[model samples]
Target: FDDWEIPDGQITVGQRIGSGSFGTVYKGKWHGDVAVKMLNTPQQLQAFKNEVGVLRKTRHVNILLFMGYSTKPQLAIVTQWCEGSSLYHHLHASETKFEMKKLIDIARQTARGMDYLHAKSIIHRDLKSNNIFLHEDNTVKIGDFGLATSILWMAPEVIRMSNPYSFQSDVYAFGIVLYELMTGQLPYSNINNRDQIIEMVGRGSLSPDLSKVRSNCPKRMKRLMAECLKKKRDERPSFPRILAEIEELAR
Candidate 1:
């Protein structure tokens, strides 16, 4: 567990912001503004600690900033609040559409953050629009780890449990996220069966198709997505390489 702790009475919980299988996140006032994730049960607590451990070692503008945590009254992890809705909501729920430049910028920022994590040998294991956050200024930050091992965005090797998750798996999920950002649709939306999706991906027969993206979507991005979704993990580019490729598009 991390030595950093949030003192009692300093935090004032507000409305619920989001929830996952094991925890609920709330908007709160801590110092100035913060998001607090409250975890119950031993399993949730363990996952909370795991997230804290990763946050303690990582610091980047594109990554969620960890404020502190507590375990007394309840187990919770506090992080800097992002006022803008998640990338998922922005893409699918909002009436306003984003410009291509802004979308590429979001992808660039996420790649930078992922690069930082990979440099530190920390695999996010979960990289999706829902986990990517945006700020009022359009700043992008990656958040959420509760379902880091879930199969929905998992890499083939990860689904097979052939080996532990690595940077490549994160890249694979990143490709899926890029597709979502471009099309405002989830991968395999046509496939209603979860088991079918898993079996297809596990057998190296299925992956997100970027061909459905708008005509305005950049060709470079489509190529990058293809490389990331390659069946062979070794074919996937490293985060640093991904950052470089996206950076070119951003310019």
Candidate 2:
């Protein structure tokens, strides 16, 4: 709606909070504290607008709150300030000790958010850890609408160019993220070369080795991840089925 347009004066830009190659996320004052994504170049605007378009239609507790935006004084998108920062940041932190039960909760909430998006006919082409925001209380909100969707988490179909990409593709990527959460290690962590990992994942023969690290982890949860990573696109369960399966896994 036109109401989504935010004026410059009402918003008070503050210190920098997060930075990306194209932009910086700042700690700003709106109704209260908020995260502001500032776009740098005109090239970044088109993609950033795509994000704004997608985010405006979204409404979910598990997604970063898209408050409003301002184009003047620079392109800025304001959203809820996530205290825990991001899932990638925490998962990779040496001091971080992510508990299994907590990981399950994050997985389910993320699934719920995806479920909502799929219902709206929106497919997240770039789904990964860095795009996911986290709160101190284990709250996880998927972000970064400008879709790495890095090769490590890319769907085989996408990498192979066998299929353009569908909602199921997003599930495929999420499966890798689950693998990361399950083991607290990046998928293909055992591998050294990015080139090798790309071919390995795209080939669809490689699966994240949980043989030792999370050996004692929930079998049902691991099984669900496998279904998500199923080689056949149609075989991969939709977010609804994922939510149900994860709900069972939590128990």
Candidate 3:
């Protein structure tokens, strides 16, 4: 068992809902609604700050809201809980593939969230089906920023320089998420390791095999997905442009 402690308040842990690398998430109630979150680790502090920082800077219907947080050293971050199922679970629970219109709607909602993040100079480096939550109203919420990075370029002479982790990375991840939403499978592989996945992505050979999947996806959407999946990050479309294309396609 870890040494981290839960906060002292009205919130009572109900059940173990999810687990991750550093901690276990609990289904709990603070005031009236349910909240889901894992016990935070020391290393997760930076990620918590990053998630909250980017979220506080932007707002969109498709983006998850930051309700509040608990920073009592032992109990870390908390936010408005997303009660709907993740896109991954929703797709997997289906026998037939997702309808093309639904898939396009998910992609469009994701693009709108991306637009908000990009407007604030935040790049979500870990976009995926599991990160996209769906509400009963057919609305989508882009959640989970464990791998998000900010791209606000400050000064050139501050210190050492690193490759600007720009919005293109998010575009790549978004493409993969779009593919997964359409096919119900991860873009890279069902069996390959991380390094192999990276290698495949590097070679521009990483894409969901549509040969076995029957899809009625529009040709333009297919073309847009391809463009988003370009191996070279710099070649991908800006998030705003993606949002515009999606808006047009959605209509």
Q: Say which candidate scores most in TM-score.
A: 1
Worst window of 10 by summed lDDT in candidate 1: 144-153
lDDT of 1 at 78: 83
C-alpha root-mean-square deviation, each candidate: 3.1, 3.4, 6.9
Q: Candidate 2, overall lDDT? A: 0.79
Kindly list the per-residue Cα lDDT of model 3 for residues 134-173, writing each as its tens digit.
7757788877653344111111111123554457767867
Q: What is the TM-score of each candidate against the true structure?
A: 0.89, 0.85, 0.76
Candidate with top lDDT is 1
Q: Please give the CA lDDT of all the candidate structures.
A: 0.81, 0.79, 0.62
List of clashing residue pairs for candidate 2: none
Candidate 1, superposed: residue stretches over 4 Å from native: 1-3, 41-54, 145-150
Per-residue accuracy of model 1 over 4-122 as CA lDDT, tens digit each = 88777878999997774358889899868888888756897777677667667678888888778988777887888888868888877784488988888889999988898788777
Clashing pairs in model 1, backbone N/Cα/C closer than 3 A: none
For residues 1-251, write the lDDT of model 2, one tens digit per residue.
Answer: 35777876888888886674357888888888788889666786666667677677678888887888888787877888888887888888643777777888889899998888888787778788877888656688887654322787788888867447799899998988888888888877778998777676678787677553476578888888888888788999989999998988788
Instruction: Give per-residue lDDT, candidate 3, residue 52.
Output: 60
- lDDT-based ranking: 1, 2, 3
